[PDB]
Structures are given as C-alpha cells and as structure tokens.
Design goal:
The chain is mostly helical and about 130 residues long. It is about 30% helix and about 5% strand. The structure holds chloride ion (CL) (2 copies), sodium ion and Rhodium. This is Lysozyme C.
C-alpha cells in the first residue's frame, strides 16, 4: 500500500506513535517519507546481505527474520514479510522496540540525516488527528 501523508499520520497516531519515547508524530511521518516514500512494500538489499523492509525500512540483521541474513538476530520476533503488510501494526510494534533500545530515532539513518532538527510539524499540517 502507498499511504497518503495524512492517511499515514492518522494510522501512526491510532497505533500509538504520537510522542512515543517523546517523538512527535511528525518525526515518524518524516522518517517514513524518506525511508519508504510511504510504500509499505518497500525493500532495500544492503551490501552486507541484510534487507530493509516496509514503511520504516526495518533491517533483517537485528530486527526480523528473512531466512537469508546469515548470523542475524530477530529481536522483534517476526518474519520480515510481516513488515510489508497494508496493516502497519507489525512495523509500528517493531519501531517501538527499536526506538526504545538506546539510540532513539538515530537508528533510522534517513531520520538522522533528513528529519532530525527540522520543522517536523509540517508533516502533519492539514491532517485530521
Ligand atoms: Cl520491494
Ligand atoms: Cl536469517
Ligand atoms: Na534476522
Ligand atoms: Rh490499524
């Protein structure tokens, strides 16, 4: 599914990301735009053999099992395929574990490089929430 900006903002708010670990909703919408272009089916193969999956490009080296990332963990205890669903539940619940682990949203390189310290409020302008 390719979400609209306000559509994803509303779903992320429903699934409890607004101010989760102190990150306003706009941080999560900005991260999803630059990670996945709001496409739940986005995948990126890394040169290390891991793959990034879904709306928040969650990586198979640590967080999900894809059966093809040798030596990897599965800390969200999910198949990576669950992170590509139209239903953002699995992505959001894993994203909550990632952002809670110590480096906060810096775990998302696109958030660090493109969203962090910017006017992230802009991403929820015009949305019903
Ligand atoms: Cl893909
Ligand atoms: Cl694996
Ligand atoms: Na893995
Ligand atoms: Rh939902």
């Amino acid at each position: 599914k390719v979400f609209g900006r306000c559509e994803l903002a509303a779903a992320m708010k429903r699934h409890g990301l607004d101010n989760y670990r102190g990150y306003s909703l706009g941080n999560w919408v900005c991260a999803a735009k630059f990670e996945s272009n709001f496409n739940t089916q986005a995948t990126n193969r890394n040169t290390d053999g891991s793959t990034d999956y879904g709306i928040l490009q969650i990586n198979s080296r640590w967080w999900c099992n894809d059966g093809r990332t040798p030596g990897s963990r599965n800390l969200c205890n999910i198949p990576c395929s669950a992170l590509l669903s139209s239903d953002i539940t699995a992505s959001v619940n894993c994203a909550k574990k990632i952002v809670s682990d110590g480096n906060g949203m810096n775990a998302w390189v696109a958030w660090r490089n493109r969203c962090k310290g910017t006017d992230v409020q802009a991403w929820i302008r015009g949305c019903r929430l």
